[PDB]
Coordinates of C-alpha atoms in Angstrom, one line a residue:
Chain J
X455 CA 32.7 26.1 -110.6
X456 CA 29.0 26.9 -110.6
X457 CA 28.0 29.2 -108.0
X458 CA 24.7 29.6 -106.8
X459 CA 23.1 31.9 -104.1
X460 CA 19.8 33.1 -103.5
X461 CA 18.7 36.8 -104.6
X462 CA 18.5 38.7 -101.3
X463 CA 14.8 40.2 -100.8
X464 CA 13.9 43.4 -99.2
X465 CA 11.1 43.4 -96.7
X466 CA 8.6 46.0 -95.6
X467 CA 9.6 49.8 -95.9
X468 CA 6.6 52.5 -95.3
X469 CA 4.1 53.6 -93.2
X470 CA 4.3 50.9 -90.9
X471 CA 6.0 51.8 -87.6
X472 CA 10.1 50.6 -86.2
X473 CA 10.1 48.3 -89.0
X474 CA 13.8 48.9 -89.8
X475 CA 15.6 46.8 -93.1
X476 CA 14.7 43.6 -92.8
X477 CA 14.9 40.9 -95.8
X478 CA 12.7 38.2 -96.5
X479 CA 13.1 34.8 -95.3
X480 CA 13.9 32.7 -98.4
X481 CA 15.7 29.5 -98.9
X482 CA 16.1 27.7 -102.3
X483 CA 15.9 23.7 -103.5
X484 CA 15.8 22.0 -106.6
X485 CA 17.7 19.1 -108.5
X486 CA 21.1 18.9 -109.6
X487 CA 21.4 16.7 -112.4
X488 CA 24.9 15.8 -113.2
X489 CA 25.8 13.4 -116.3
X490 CA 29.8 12.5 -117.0
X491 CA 30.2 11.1 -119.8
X492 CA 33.8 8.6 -119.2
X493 CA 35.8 6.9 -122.3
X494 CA 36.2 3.9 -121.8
X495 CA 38.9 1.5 -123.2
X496 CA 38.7 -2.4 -124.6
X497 CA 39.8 -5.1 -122.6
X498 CA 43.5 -6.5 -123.3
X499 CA 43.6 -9.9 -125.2
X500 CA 44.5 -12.9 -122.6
X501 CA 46.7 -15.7 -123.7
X502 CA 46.4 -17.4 -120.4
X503 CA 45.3 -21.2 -120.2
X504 CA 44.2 -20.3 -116.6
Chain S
X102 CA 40.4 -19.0 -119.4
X103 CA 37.9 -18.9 -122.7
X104 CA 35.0 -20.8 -120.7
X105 CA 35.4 -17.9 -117.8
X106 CA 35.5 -15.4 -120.3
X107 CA 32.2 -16.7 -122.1
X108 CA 30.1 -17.3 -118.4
X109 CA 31.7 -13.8 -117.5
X110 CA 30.8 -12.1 -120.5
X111 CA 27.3 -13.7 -122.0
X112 CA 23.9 -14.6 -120.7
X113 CA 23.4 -17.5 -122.6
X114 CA 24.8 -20.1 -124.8
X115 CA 23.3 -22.6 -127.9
X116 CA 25.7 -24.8 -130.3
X117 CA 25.3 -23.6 -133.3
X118 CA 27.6 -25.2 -136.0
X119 CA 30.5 -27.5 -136.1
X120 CA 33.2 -28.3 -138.7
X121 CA 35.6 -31.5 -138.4
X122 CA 38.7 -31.5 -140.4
X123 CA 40.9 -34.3 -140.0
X124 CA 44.3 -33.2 -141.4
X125 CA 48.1 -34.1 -141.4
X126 CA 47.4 -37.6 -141.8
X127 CA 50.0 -40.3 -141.8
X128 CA 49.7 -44.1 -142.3
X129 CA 53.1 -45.1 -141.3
X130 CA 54.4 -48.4 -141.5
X131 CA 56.4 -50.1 -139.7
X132 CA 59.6 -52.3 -139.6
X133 CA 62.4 -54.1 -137.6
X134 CA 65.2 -51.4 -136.5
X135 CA 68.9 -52.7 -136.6
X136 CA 69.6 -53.4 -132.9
X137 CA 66.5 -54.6 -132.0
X138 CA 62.9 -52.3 -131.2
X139 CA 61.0 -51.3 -134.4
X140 CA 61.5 -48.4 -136.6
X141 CA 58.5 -46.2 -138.7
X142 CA 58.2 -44.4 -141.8
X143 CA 55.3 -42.7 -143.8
X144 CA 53.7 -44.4 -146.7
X145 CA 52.9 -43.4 -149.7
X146 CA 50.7 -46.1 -150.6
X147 CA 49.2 -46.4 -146.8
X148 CA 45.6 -44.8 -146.6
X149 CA 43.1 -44.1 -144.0
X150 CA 39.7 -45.0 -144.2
X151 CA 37.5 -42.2 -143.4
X152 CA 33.5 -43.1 -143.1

């Protein structure tokens, strides 16, 4: 399992007035490349005429 | 089965060689069989032209 979640951000803490703890409003994209590599076995010999 | 396998399998398709080989030959002559009908048996001194 890969787990992924993005690293909460404090806001504003200071001088400024009824601010409270807020954190910042992120969100995260990107590309998940995925590449399977799969064995793969001959085909069986066919005697048929048909 | 083959010809499927080859149209199947390959995108094209050129003669390239071929090799006849005539084998197992038998002149056989041929005689009356007791009874009636014919009977056959191989020769030795029978041949077949091949041109």
């Amino acid at each position: 399992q890969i787990f992924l979640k993005i690293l909460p951000q404090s806001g504003p803490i200071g001088g400024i007035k009824s601010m409270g703890i807020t954190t910042l409003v992120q969100y995260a994209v990107g590309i998940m490349t995925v590449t399977m590599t799969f064995k793969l076995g001959p085909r069986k010999a066919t005697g048929r005429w048909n | 089965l083959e010809f499927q396998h080859l149209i199947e399998n390959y995108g094209s398709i050129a003669p390239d060689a071929l090799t006849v080989t005539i084998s197992e030959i038998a002149v056989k002559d041929v005689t009356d069989k007791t009874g009636g009908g014919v009977q056959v048996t191989d020769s030795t001194t029978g041949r077949l032209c091949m041109l």
